[PDB]
Design a protein around this ligand. Sequence first.
Ligand SMILES: CCOC(=O)CNC(=O)NCc1ccc(N)cc1
Length: 160
Amino acid sequence: MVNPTVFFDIAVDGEPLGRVSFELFADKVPKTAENFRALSTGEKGFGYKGSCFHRIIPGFMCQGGAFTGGKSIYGEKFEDENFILKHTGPGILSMANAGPNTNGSQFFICTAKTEWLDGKHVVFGKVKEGMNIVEAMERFGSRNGKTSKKITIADCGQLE
Ligand SMILES: CCOC(=O)CNC(=O)NCc1ccc(N)cc1
């Protein structure tokens, strides 16, 4: 089977910035890819639509996925599936966590190589189209992650 592709339409204080799409590496991390895919379509009855990027650190990453801390599709938190894929550069999609085996819905998009996270955060996808949109988002962050405008996922879903 072809790896899934999903998309986010990004808005800044309600004004459209464009569409970002992601390849999900289901061939290496099937359970982790399936969680993000289903949260993007809304098929379990909840997910990423309407949520914000709450933590943005320029030169590092954009983090989102906490909706009313977030939750996985497998009921609160699931195990680290593997560490096959590494944090190799801009556009890498990886799971946020609060220690071992604490994956939920929160995720981050890298804007640099973040090798110090290897073996602790599960990498599961990469930006395919719209990397410049992620770079534009990054400009609304700060040292501590606070955003100066409301950066939201206005819409989301599956393309393949
Ligand atoms: C670049 C990645 O940096 C972090 O992951 C920092 N930790 C973090 O935000 N922890 C909060 C959190 C709570 C519950 C779940 N499920 C996931 C995350």
